[PDB]
Design a protein around this ligand. Sequence first.
Ligand SMILES: [Zn+2]
Ligand SMILES: [Zn+2]
Lengths: 50, 67, 121, 117, 134, 74
Amino acid sequence: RPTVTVFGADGKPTGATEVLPKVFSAPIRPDIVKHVHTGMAKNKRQPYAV
Amino acid sequence: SDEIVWQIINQQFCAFKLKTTKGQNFCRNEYSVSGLCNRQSCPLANSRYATVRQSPKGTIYLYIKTI
Amino acid sequence: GKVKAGQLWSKNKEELTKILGELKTELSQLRIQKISSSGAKLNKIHDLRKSIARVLTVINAKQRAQLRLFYKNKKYLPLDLRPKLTRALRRRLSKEDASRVLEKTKKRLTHFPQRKYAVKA
Amino acid sequence: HFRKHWQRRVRCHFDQPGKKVTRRLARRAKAAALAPRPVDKLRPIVRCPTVKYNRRTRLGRGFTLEELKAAGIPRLLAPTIGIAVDHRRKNLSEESLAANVQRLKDYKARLILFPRK
Amino acid sequence: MKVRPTVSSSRRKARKAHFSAPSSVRRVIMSAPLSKELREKYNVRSIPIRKGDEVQIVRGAHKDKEGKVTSVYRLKYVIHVERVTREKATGQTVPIGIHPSNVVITKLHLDKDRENILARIKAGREQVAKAKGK
Amino acid sequence: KTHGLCRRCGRRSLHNQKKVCASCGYPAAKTRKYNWSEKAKRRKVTGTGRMRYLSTVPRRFKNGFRTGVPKGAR
RNA sequence: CUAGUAACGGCGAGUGAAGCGGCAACAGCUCAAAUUUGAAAGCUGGCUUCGGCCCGCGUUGUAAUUUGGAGAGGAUGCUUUGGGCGAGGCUCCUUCUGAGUUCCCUGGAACGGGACGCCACAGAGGGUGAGAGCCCCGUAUAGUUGGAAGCCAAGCCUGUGUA
RNA sequence: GAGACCGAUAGCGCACAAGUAGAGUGAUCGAAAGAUGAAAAGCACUUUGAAAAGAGGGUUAAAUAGCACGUGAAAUUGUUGA
RNA sequence: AAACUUUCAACAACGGAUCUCUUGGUUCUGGCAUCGAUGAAGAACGCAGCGAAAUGCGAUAAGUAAUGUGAAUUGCAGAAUUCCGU
Ligand SMILES: [Zn+2]
Ligand SMILES: [Zn+2]
């Protein structure tokens, strides 16, 4: 799809449209997302020991 | 990209998926002809789809989704 | 029974030492007759003790202030009147000694001080 | 290489995000004191010693006396206007001299100076 | 959510501070809402309770019971109200504990410090409404 | 009896014949303390007693070790 | 990072750097070695009407000048100043600042369920007779009342000696 | 100020009288032990009798929650029935 | 036939597991730099009507002065002590 419609403050279409960027046509890779998200969620962690 | 959408839903996660120990999986989507999580009856993976639902006034409607 | 400290500060020295004697002779006479039926006498003893402390505080504060008026020109204050601080704070260099600098250093600061400037983009 | 007690002498770095905040606050604390001035002093352009890094060029410690006098900056004024001064370094070639008296001349063009009192 | 670093979101530090509080800050905790009539006249929502306050219980098994405060027990976070009592086994009538958050103050016990409290809340509430309005 | 009352540490660890404490070493100016007994250190360390003067130091530092009286006080 | 490199090794066990390079931070100075010699110019104490008087130290050396990528002394001509108040501001403590206890049901008790609202730069947390943004303390935001000590400082008084 | 930590045989030895109680001539060694209920309303009164105990009766939503107190497993034990 | 023993069930004991809780611990991070001959740290002896295997204090002894708040303390006795008020 070339364009995406821009909606107004009232919820109705304004009449202006924007072109969808190329990042929305990128590959969708669940294996990549899962691998990164597993290590990403570890990066906030705060150490514990006895 | 209907095959890619099925690969995310079936293998990873679906919010409408009910898993039982009895060997069959169930679909909790209200727009499903059969409450089962197979490929032929997924409202999400199938861009063109049909279902039949009942209004509380008693009227039966045919819901058609097009891509 | 209890004497407010507001009346305490206004009076002079001989009025304090007479009232302190009046509380002390009263306090001693209570405990002789407090050993039997220690009821409201025990509450009076608690109020008598607190009033003795308030009187003794005003006498000491007046005497210490009179000493600090006497030593206002002398340079050797008694040890009880000097400030406590800490031990190490009392052996630190004075504010004027540590701020003292050589004549060569003052000459360079007078004629070449740190300037105030900026660099444009 | 764990023959000695490496258990008693192991250092982690969980203060790495916290030390960066302190270091950036120290640069902000310094710029509050030196409010129109830049944080860091001007430094000269020098050539790296060895044969491995002869072709590379880095910032030095301070400007030579001959570089300051050629640019027109007096020696006793330079530390008070943001110019670092090195008495140990020598010039030894006209290429080291000309690169730095261009840098000091470029510093003066971009410098705005305010009177004393 | 919380922003300032001095603020703590610890349940442990909050529960320790509530149950080990001094009676000065127990007073602020032991505070009650004012009535609809008292809100529209003093422009004040909530003040701490003192002994002379006529009050009305609006939560608990003793709902819709009105009376004067008999005691402000800060050690157990309890107020006592006139004629809100139960009998022991012996027949002796004991005060029943109502928390200050379960009552609405109907009449204040006014002294010079109380009008100063009521003025300072009204001054701040008027100031921010003016600052928000204009 | 081998040991008697010690004036410094208050225990019955003062040897009668030698007149030297087994716990603190009373005739010695220094208090006996060894690093191979961390438990013995924490038994006599600062904070295990009254802390009679050292408790007052943190509050006075917070105020800058000030001296004087508040303005307009009686 | 160099780097388990160089080096040393019953050359087995093994031990084990540094220079260069990228960064973080940056700041430079004080004496002794000189003759103030046309003037010990320096300093500790004591008494003090606080203003300035005595004793002592010290010439076997206390000030000023100088500290080797320097310096001194002449000469010459340009360029630089010194004190005291001080409005006000920053830091930190404090005072105050939003909205339902509306109706029904269960319940010993609503803080639960249902209906209708409200606040939100505040739906962090805690208490309250059971899961509470709107019952209470707090929390967010700028302000605002009072105060403490440091620092800075607009300005305003004076400056002076062939320094 | 926090936590992808532990949750009363755990987590510091110590959530509580914890370097306490206790042991040793001494240096030293060093425990066990949290939880009624929303609120003590912590069982008035009658009646057994010498007791950290019953039978009535009462409080409480509940007393088979009675300061042996939330829940109350198993080992083990008693009574009744097959 | 009793008893005794065994198994199972109900009820009643013993014991304190399991579930739930947490004014405790553990670990990390951040701001700051303050003991003592002006007598510290530590050790005793005392001060409250009933009190410790607590806490506070020092013959001014569960405390006095001063400032702020503004109406308590509380297990029971007990205070003509204080409420438009130094
Ligand atoms: Zn599905
Ligand atoms: Zn000893």
